Amino acid sequence: DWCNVSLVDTSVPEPGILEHDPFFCPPTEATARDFLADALVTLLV
């Protein structure tokens, strides 16, 4: 059938990260103190 003869040639058909930033959540930094020496002073006076 010559009517459905198809010819095709070459053509030019030419058509991940994860991150979220919150603002802050710092813990108790510099965790050290004492309430004896000052108590000793104010109970030694």
Partner 1 sequence: TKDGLRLEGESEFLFPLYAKEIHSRVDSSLLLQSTQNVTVNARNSDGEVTGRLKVGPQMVEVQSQQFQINSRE
Ligand X SMILES: *[C@@H]1O[C@H](CO)[C@@H](O)[C@H](O)[C@H]1NC(C)=O
> What does 3 bind: ligand X, partner 1, none (CB cut-off 5 to 8 Å by kind)?
ligand X
42 binds ligand X (CB under 6 A): no
CA–CA separation, 20 and 37 (whole Å):
46
Beta carbon nearer to partner 1, 9 or 19: 19
Q: What would the DSSP string read from start to end of the chain?
A: --TT------------------S------S----SSHHHHHHHH-
Beta carbon nearer to ligand X, 1 or 19: 1
Q: Which of 13, 20, 30, 32 binds partner 1 (CB under 8 A)?
A: 20
